[PDB]
Write a protein that binds this ligand. Structure first.
Ligand code: NA
Length: 129
């Protein structure tokens, strides 16, 4: 599923991300925009052989099991395929664990390089939230 911008904002809100570890909703939207273009089916292979999955490009090196990332963890205890669902609960729940682990949203390289230090409130302009 390819979410609309406001549609995604409202689902992320409902799922408890706005101000999660202090990151406002527009941070999470901006990150989803640049990580996946708001597409829950987005996958991209990393150089190391791990793969990033879903709307927030969660990595099989640490967070989920895809059975082809040798020498990896599954810290969210989920198959990576659960991260591709049109229902974003699994992605959200896992993103909570990632953002809590010490580096905040710097864990998302697109957030750091494309959202951090920018006007992210724009990402939620005109959404009925
Ligand atoms: Na893994």
């Amino acid at each position: 599923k390819v979410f609309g911008r406001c549609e995604l904002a409202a689902a992320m809100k409902r799922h408890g991300l706005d101000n999660y570890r202090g990151y406002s909703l527009g941070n999470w939207v901006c990150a989803a925009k640049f990580e996946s273009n708001f597409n829950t089916q987005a996958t991209n292979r990393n150089t190391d052989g791990s793969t990033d999955y879903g709307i927030l490009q969660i990595n099989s090196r640490w967070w989920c099991n895809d059975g082809r990332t040798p020498g990896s963890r599954n810290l969210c205890n989920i198959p990576c395929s659960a991260l591709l669902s049109s229902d974003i609960t699994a992605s959200v729940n896992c993103a909570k664990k990632i953002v809590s682990d010490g580096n905040g949203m710097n864990a998302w390289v697109a957030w750091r390089n494309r959202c951090k230090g920018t006007d992210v409130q724009a990402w939620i302009r005109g959404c009925r939230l």
